[PDB]
């Protein structure tokens, strides 16, 4: 099996990350990378704690961890989070001053974030860091982008195959969002991984109740059920994210909420570092109750006690949907995730697909639209449908205790209300 962490390892976790213990799969990955120096492909679900797997090992041994990712604003967010935890880190690119390069060469930075493009164009730097400081691990986030069948293919990822040539002694952790075998096979081949440890957290978030409801024709009438009149004003029942498919719909939703004097903020791709910091401050401290968002990552919506998620409009696809609802209930307490949709929603509109150029991509949008619509229309357990997608296999109901109970999803709750059976075994 896997040996337990030692005292020094647990002390370092507490000192720098604020956690009393590792989660099981975090430990499997960290032990494998840190103590067995083994390549890893790790599938980690929402809010499990994926970042610890590449941030912890270089902090523990005092060397460099290289993190490769296309998501620049997210890397900036992570650098700030690390700095606030007394861990030095930086985002290294072309614009960087000469002096930051010398600081990295002297080992100032425990975690170095780079884009795929920067990484591919500076292998000599990495070899110098490897020889002078030592690289504990290379983390490739979004590693599915190196696959054509990963549907987010990035040509910038193709040249990551040189990593194992240039740095044969350095273990690579590849992080991906589903347990798909065809994606895993492409990651292993394109990253030249050697006998990697494969791990999967599984995907369930049992404290997230799932519900789907049709739009009624007016924004306030749609959102009213989620509101409570505390004497003198309206409020959401608790902290809420409303996901919208476009900035235009975001502005529509925001205008209606301001008719009720509800405190809210918006959250979009492209917001400055200072803007994302300010939203993070206001949301965490509950100075705004609701964030209306067109993106599902970044510090702005990083809050432990989000009680309600509302998709205002059909979600884009199962993967975006899962990541979006996963921002809810990070504290483990009960939360709800509601989709409000109509057949006319833009994410269900096949007539918008006629003008996209790539046939293989358009067939994917078609299949994903079809899958999302089938989910939204279903009378069956919502949680089973989602879990089956991410496991890449039919998940059977009652492989999990939440499934089939009143808190599982609207369709399970309805079947129980209509004299259904409660699966004592």
Ligand X SMILES: Nc1ncnc2c1ncn2[C@@H]1O[C@H](COP(=O)(O)OP(=O)(O)O)[C@@H](O)[C@H]1O
| Interface contacts to ligand X, rule CB under 6 A | 19, 22-23, 26, 44, 46-52, 330
Whichever of 306 and 409 has its CB closer to ligand X, that residue is: 306
23 annotated to a ligand binding site: yes
Question: Please, which residue, 41 or 244, has the CB nearer to Cl ion?
Answer: 244
Q: Which stretch binds Cl ion (CB under 5 A): 82-90, 251-259, 275-283, 308-316?
A: 308-316
Between 51 and 266, CB nearer to ligand X: 51
345 sits near Cl ion (criterion: CB under 5 A): yes
244 marked as part of a ligand binding site: no
List, edge to edge, every strand of the sheet that includes 240-243: 208-214, 335-341, 308-312, 240-243, 290-293, 264-267
Do 198 and 184 contact (CB within 8 A), yes or no? yes
Which of residues 220, 245, 252, 380 is near Cl ion by CB under 5 A? 245
Shortest Cβ 333–Cl ion spacing (Å): 30
Among 116, 313, 315, 404, binds Cl ion (CB under 5 A): 313
47 is in an annotated binding site: yes
**Coil, helix or strand at residue 16:** helix
Ordered alpha helix ranges (H), 307-417: 318-325, 359-377, 382-391, 410-417
Q: Contact between 346 and Cl ion (CB under 5 A)?
A: yes
Q: Is 26 annotated as a binding residue?
A: yes
Which one of Cl ion, ligand X, none is in contact with 371 (Cβ closer than 5 to 8 A by kind)? none
Among 338, 341, 342, 311, residue whose Cα is nearest residue 409: 338
The conformation of residue 3, written as its DSSP 8-state character, comes to: P
Q: How many whole angstroms separate alpha carbon 191 and alpha carbon 163?
A: 7
d(CA 352, CA 92): 39
Name the minimum Å distance from CB 346 to Cl ion: 4
Q: Which is nearer to Cl ion, 307 or 316 (CB)?
A: 316
Minimum gap (Å) between residue 326 Cβ and ligand X: 7
Is residue 222 involved in binding Cl ion (CB under 5 A)?
no
Q: Report helix, strand and coil shares of the chain as percent, to nearest 5.
A: 45, 15, 40
- The item of ligand X, Cl ion, none sharing an interface with residue 345, based on CB under 5 to 8 Å by kind, is Cl ion
Burial class (CB in 10 A: 0-12, 13-18, 19+), 94: exposed
Q: Which is nearer to ligand X, 161 or 202 (CB)?
A: 202
264 annotated ligand-binding residue: no
Element (H, E) at 292: strand 290-293
In 62-153, alpha helices (H): 72-84, 98-105, 116-120, 123-132
DSSP 168-234: TTS-EEEEESS--HHHHHHHHHHTT--S-EEEE-----TTEEEEEEE--SSHHHHHGGGEEEETTEE
In terms of Cα–Cα distance, which of 6, 30, 29, 9 is closest to 19?
9
The reply, when asked if residue 119 is annotated as ligand binding, is no
Quote the least distance from Cβ 337 to ligand X, whole Å: 16
| 9 labeled part of a ligand binding site | no
Residue 116 binding Cl ion, by CB under 5 A: no
In angstroms, what is the minimal distance from the CB of 245 to Cl ion?
Answer: 5
Residue nearest to ligand X (CB): 49
Q: Is 238 in the site for Cl ion (CB under 5 A)?
A: no
**Nearer CB in complex with Cl ion: 21/246:** 246
- Residue of minimal Cβ distance to Cl ion: 313
Q: Which does 49 bind (CB under 5 to 8 A by kind): Cl ion, ligand X, none?
A: ligand X
Q: Around 214, how many Cα atoms within 13 Å sit in the side-chain half-sphere?
A: 7
Q: Which does 186 bind (CB under 5 to 8 A by kind): ligand X, Cl ion, none?
A: none
Closer residue to Cl ion (CB): 294 or 388: 294
φ, ψ dihedrals at 68, nearest 5°: -105, 130
Binding site residue list: 19, 21, 23, 26, 47, 381, 408-409, 412
Binding site residue list for ATP: 19, 21, 23, 26, 47
Binding site residue list for Zn(2+): 381, 408-409, 412
Q: Which positions touch Cl ion (CB under 5 A)?
A: 245, 313, 345-346
């Amino acid at each position: 099996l896997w040996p337990a962490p030692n005292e020094e390892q647990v002390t370092c976790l507490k000192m720098y990350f604020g956690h009393s213990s590792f989660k099981p799969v975090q430990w499997k990955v960290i032990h494998s990378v840190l103590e067995e120096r083994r390549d890893n492909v790790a599938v980690m679900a929402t809010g499990y704690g994926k970042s610890l797997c590449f941030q912890y090992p270089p902090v523990y041994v005092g060397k460099i961890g290289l993190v490769i990712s296309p998501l620049i604003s997210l890397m900036e967010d992570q650098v700030l989070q690390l700095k606030m935890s007394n861990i030095p880190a930086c985002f290294l690119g072309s614009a960087q001053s000469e002096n930051v390069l010398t600081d990295i060469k002297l080992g100032k930075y425990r975690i170095v974030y780079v884009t795929p493009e920067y990484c591919s164009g500076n292998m000599g730097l990495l070899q110098q860091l490897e020889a002078d400081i030592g690289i504990t691990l290379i983390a490739v986030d979004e590693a599915h982008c190196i696959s054509e069948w990963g549907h987010d293919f990035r040509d910038s990822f193709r040249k990551l195959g040189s990593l194992k040539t240039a740095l044969p002694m350095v273990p690579i952790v590849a992080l991906t969002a589903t347990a798909s075998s065809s994606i895993r096979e492409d990651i292993v081949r394109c990253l030249n991984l050697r006998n990697p440890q494969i791990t999967c957290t599984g995907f369930d978030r049992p404290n997230l109740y799932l519900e789907v409801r049709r739009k009624t024709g007016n924004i306030l009438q749609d959102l009213q059920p989620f509101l409570v009149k505390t004497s003198s004003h309206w409020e959401f029942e608790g902290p809420t994210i409303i996901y919208c498919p476009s900035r235009k719909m975001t502005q529509q939703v925001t205008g209606e909420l301001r008719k009720l004097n509800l405190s809210c903020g918006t959250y979009h791709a492209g917001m400055s570092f200072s803007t994302r910091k300010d939203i993070h401050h206001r949301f965490v401290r509950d100075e705004i109750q609701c964030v209306i968002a067109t993106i599902a990552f970044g510090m702005g919506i990083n809050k432990a006690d989000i009680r309600q998620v509302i998709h205002y409009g059909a979600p884009k696809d199962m993967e975006s949907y899962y990541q979006e609802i996963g921002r809810a209930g990070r504290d483990g307490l009960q939360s709800s995730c509601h989709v409000l949709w109509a057949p006319a929603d833009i994410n269900l509109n096949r007539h918008l697909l006629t003008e996209i150029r790539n046939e293989k991509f358009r067939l994917y949008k078609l299949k994903m639209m079809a899958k999302m619509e089938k989910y939204l229309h279903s009378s069956r357990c919502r949680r089973q449908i989602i879990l089956s997608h991410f496991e890449d296999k039919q998940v059977q109901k009652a492989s999990l205790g939440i499934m089939g109970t009143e808190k599982c999803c609207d369709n399970c709750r309805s079947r129980l209300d209509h004299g259904g059976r409660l699966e004592v075994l």
